[PDB]
Amino acid sequence: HRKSGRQLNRNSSHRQAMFRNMAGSLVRHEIIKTTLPKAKELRRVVEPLITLAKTDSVANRRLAFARTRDNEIVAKLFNELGPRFASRAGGYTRILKCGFRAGDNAPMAYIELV
Amino acid sequence: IQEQTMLNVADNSGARRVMCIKVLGGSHRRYAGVGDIIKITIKEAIPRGKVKKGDVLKAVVVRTKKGVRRPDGSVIRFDGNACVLLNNNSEQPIGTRIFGPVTRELRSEKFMKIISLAPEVL
RNA sequence: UAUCGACGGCGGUGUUUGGCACCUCGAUGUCGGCUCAUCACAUCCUGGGGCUGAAGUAGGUCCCAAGGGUAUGGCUGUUCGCCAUUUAAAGUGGUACGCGAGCUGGGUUUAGAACGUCGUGAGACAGUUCGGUCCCUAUCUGCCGUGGGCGGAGAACUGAGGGGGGCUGCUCCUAGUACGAGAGGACCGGAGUGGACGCAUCACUGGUGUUCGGGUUGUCAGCCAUGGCACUGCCCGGUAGCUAAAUGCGGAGAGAUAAGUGCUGAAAGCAUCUAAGCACGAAACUUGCCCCGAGAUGAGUUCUCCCGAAGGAACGUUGAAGACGACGACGUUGAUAGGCCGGGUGUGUAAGCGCAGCAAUGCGUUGAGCUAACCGGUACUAAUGAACCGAGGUCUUGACCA
RNA sequence: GGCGUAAUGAUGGCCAGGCUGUCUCCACCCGAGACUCAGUGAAAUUGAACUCGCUGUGAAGAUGCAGUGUACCCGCGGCAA
RNA sequence: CGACACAGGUGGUCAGGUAGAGAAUACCAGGCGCUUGAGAGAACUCGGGUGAAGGAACUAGGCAAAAUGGUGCCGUAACUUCGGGAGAAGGCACGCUGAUUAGCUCGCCUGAUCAGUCGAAGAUACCAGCUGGCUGCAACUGUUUAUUAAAAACACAGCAC
RNA sequence: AAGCCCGCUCGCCGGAAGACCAAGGGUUCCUGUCCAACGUUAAUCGGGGCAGGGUGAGUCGACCCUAAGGCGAGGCCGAAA
RNA sequence: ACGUCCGUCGUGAAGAGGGAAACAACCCAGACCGCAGCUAAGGUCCCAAAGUCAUGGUUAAGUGGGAAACGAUGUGGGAAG
RNA sequence: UUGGGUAACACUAACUGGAGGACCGAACCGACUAAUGUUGAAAAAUUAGCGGAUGACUUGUGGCUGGGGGUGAAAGGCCAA
C-alpha cells in the first residue's frame, strides 16, 4: 500500500459530497452525531470555511456559500460565532469521541461549537 | 535497430536509404546497435553505373534513436538512424566523405581510420 | 590395417517399421502444435582426451562434457518437407508417444453444401474442401506460503539441515610474425571492453498519476466572478512514490580424486607407476558465501514471567506490520495522530477598483492568489479505568556446601 | 452443360498504404465484490479405512503389495499433480 | 403468458414540454428510490477505458481494437445496360467578437463581406465508410436447417422441350 | 424501526418506472382491526389474514347484423352422426 | 496381431498347512473339537521360538547372486615332447 | 417540357419529374467471430464486435387444410418446444 491519504468509506462520489451537509449541521445546531470517521474530516469542512470568512467582506462571504448550500447558517457564521472567536486561532469546534450507540455499532461524539 | 528496418546512409556511395538485414555475431530478438557491423541491402540509390539498388553489402551503425547513457550519467538521443557502407578491405568505407558526428569509444580502441574522416565528435 | 571398406560371420539398442490380439473398445475421444507445472541424458561449438590417409598446417572419425546458451520468419490446418536471411553452439530420448478436473483448437470421427469417384439411385466413398459446442463453488491427499496451540509465558537470539552457474567473445601490451620458395598461416600471463544469468537499491536519466493546474461543450445558480452535475463531462500536462530502455554489488584460495604424468619397489635376484606404500594431477566433489528454515522426533535455546505473588493475556492510541492471526511503537516519566504556525513543494496572476474595452475578455494594480496523502516546532485537543488467563516450586537418585 | 464474365454479395485465399496490443512484456486505477462483521438461510456431492517417506517389486512410473525408515494437532489463502 | 413479485414475451393513443442537423444527450410536468447489508487501498476474472519503440511479427482469417468518419468549396480514375460508379480518390475551410451586405413579407430563416482576437486541438463536448489491389465462387435483393452450417446451397426474370 | 411516516439534502426515468386503454387476469380497489401464515431480512407496512363498503347511463360497451367460411332442411348416392 | 491347432508339464479348477523375502503352480506335506508329545515345511546368533551343533573342504570374492559372442603368465592342479 | 443545331433520324444543354423486390436509416432487421452462462426464468439468454435495412415486407384478430397426412422454390426440411 502507500501513505495515509483521505478516506473514501464508500466510493468516489459518495466520498466533496458528505463533507457538505453535516458540515452546516455544526452551525445550525451545536450538536451532531455521525460515526468513527465521523466528523473527524468534517472538522475540516469547518475551518476551512471559517477564516477566509473571518473578517466580513466580499472576498470571503462567497467562499462560505460555496461549500455550504444555505443562507440561514451562512450569515449566522458572521455577526455570530465570529465576531465571537476573535482573538482565537484554531480550536474552532473540536470534540471528544463518544461511546457507540444502538443499531449500527459505531462510536460517535457530538461535534459541538466552543 | 532490428531487421527489415530503414536507416539513412552517411557515406557517398550513391545510396540514400538502407534496409537493415541482420547483424554479424549477434543472435537476439532483433537488434543492431552503434558500432556493430551488419550486412544490408540498400533500397533507394542509383540503379546505374554499378548495380547498387539491390546488392547486399556490409555497413557500420553510427547513429540510432535509442538513447545510450555515459559514465557521467547523461543520455544521448538522435533523430533517425544512419550507417556507413564498407567494402571487403578489412573495415574500409566505400564512399569518400562521411556525414554526421561519431562517438568516442568508436575511435582509439577500435577504429583509427574512421575517426580521421570524422568531421564531428561528441 | 594410416580416411574408405565389399563378401561372410557374430552381437547390442529398440528411436523406425511389419507388426503373433492374454491387457483397455460395460470406451486411458485422434495426429502435431500451443500454452503450463514436475522428474532425466547414448550431444554441434568451446574445454579435457583416443585414432589418424596425425610430417607441419588444415581437416576426418570417435570418447567425454551441460557449465552457460538453443532468442526468430514467408506458403500450408498440417506433424516429420521447397526456401530465406542469422547463428561460436544452437544434440537426443522418457515421463500412460508427460502435461485439455492448466490453455489454445487451428486438425480428425455430426445436422448444410460443393467436387470427384462408385451407383440408375437415394446415397456412398477411414477422398478432399468451406462453416460448426469440449463442462464442474476439490471434500481428502500433495506441494508452495502464512498463523493459531501443544512442551508455564514477554522480549532478544541461535540455528542442524534445506536451495544456488557460469559461459562466450572483442580490444590493448605481444603476429599478417614464428614456419614456408610461394601460397598459406599458430602460441602463457596480467588487464580493459563487447554479448548474457543470478539478492536489492534510485540520489542521477526515463516511464506514470479521477492530488493538482489549464482549455472547453451542454445545463443550472439572472449576467460577471466563482461553482454543481455526466461519481476527474470532455481535451492537454503533470509531483511524490512505485517502477524502467537507471544505478551500486556478485572472489580468490584451500582440501580430496578421475584420465594422465612420475617416485620407491616386488611377484619373474633384470625390468616395471603397484600388486602394499607414496609425490602431483580436472570449470566436476565437500566447504567457504548468500537464501529458507524447529512439524529438523537429536520437533532447540535464552532470560525473565504462575512456585500466593518478582508477570502476562485482554484493553486504549498508532505503525518502519499486515488478507484472518501475527508482528512492531507508544499510552503523560507521551508528540502517536489531528489542529495552528513555520519550513520544504504544486500552479500561475487574485478579489476589488481605476482607467481598461462595444464585447469576448485584451490592461494596470499582483513575478499576485489558491492548494497539498512531506518535515519541524508545538501537546492546545485526543491515549481512562478496570477486569482477568493464572501451574503452585511432582519422584526414584552422584559430588560439593553446612 | 463446357468456357468465360460488369454490378452486387456478413462468401473463400492473398498483397499494399494507414492504423490498431492482436503479438514481443507489460502499471495501476474506476465502478460493483472478493477478506472480515448483523440478520436471513438451500441444493449438489461420500464402500470403508486413511499423515507417510525411500527403494524394490508388480502388465517394467500403486499412498493401500515387500523391506525399512518415518510420521505432532488444528486452521487460513493459492495453483491445482 | 412463461411452475414463482423469472433482467424473457405482449396491441393501440400521447413522437410539437424546453435548448439541435432529428420522435439523439441535460432538464420542468408526472412518477419513483421494490432489482439484501457492514468493515479491509491481497493473489486471484469477468466488464472497461489504451500504452513509451516496433507494429500483425499473433492468427486458419487483423477475429478483436482502432482508425477515416458533420458541413461548405475545389476536385474526382478504370469500367458501363452511361442509369452508375462518385459522399471514388485527393486537398482546403469550418471558434469566438465587432461593424455590415445580399435573398425574402418576415422569421427567434438562409447565404456571404471586412476587421479584431484565443487554444495544442474550433463539427474542441451529442453519430460516424478506413482506403486500395489481386484471386476463387455465386449473378444481385430475396430464400434456407425456429435449438451449432445462410455458404460457392435454394429461387429468380430469360431460354428450351 | 437501516428500508413505517415527516422535513431537508442527494439522484434515477422521460416513448420512458409518465397518462389513457385492448386481451387476459379478477376484486387484487377503499376503510377499520391485526399479522400465526405470505413479503429471498425486519416490519407498529402491504397487492398478506379477518370483517365491512365500493363498479347508480336510452345517447360508453354488451345486446343486433354480417365477410372468408360454416351449419341445418329438401334433391341425389349398400348404409350412416 | 493380447491365435487357430497338437504335444509335455504345470497350475485357475477341488487344496489346507509351509518355506521360498512377498507369489497359482519350485520343494515337503494334506484340515473335527479341546488338549499332550513328537516330526515334516522351513528355520534354528539376536529381534524370533529352536545348536552362534558335528566332520571335511572351498572362496575371500562380502562374492553372497542377470549376464553374453570374445580376451587373460590372477592363481591352483594333472598329463605329455 | 423549353431553347438551340439538324431535313429527318435524332443530338446537345437546362429544367421538370423522380422510378428502382435500390442505398443509408427513426422503430428497429439480420446476426459471421469469441468470452460469460451451461441443476440460465429453462426448452437456448447476456456482453464486446460485425453485416444488411418499403417490401415477394412486418404484425393483431378471425378462418381454412392434418398424419403415414398434406405440404415441400425437396432441407428429408415442416406439419403445436
Side-chain angles (χ1 to χ4, degrees), chain B residues 42-106:
Chain B
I42 57 178
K43 190 63 176 299
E44 180 181 60
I46 175 62
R48 293 178 176 59
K50 61 91 63 60
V51 61
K52 205 64 180 62
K53 180 188 297 297
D55 296 57
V56 294
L57 299 68
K58 298 294 297 180
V60 181
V61 182
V62 296
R63 300 187 299 296
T64 58
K65 297 180 177 298
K66 299 298 297 180
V68 58
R69 176 180 176 297
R70 296 184 178 181
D72 65 300
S74 63
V75 60
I76 177 65
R77 295 177 59 276
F78 300 67
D79 300 301
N81 306 299
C83 61
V84 182
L85 301 177
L86 62 75
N87 54 58
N88 298 300
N89 298 60
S90 300
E91 310 174 305
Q92 180 181 300
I94 191 286
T96 302
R97 186 177 182 179
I98 190 283
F99 177 61
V102 298
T103 59
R104 183 186 63 178
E105 298 64 60
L106 188 63

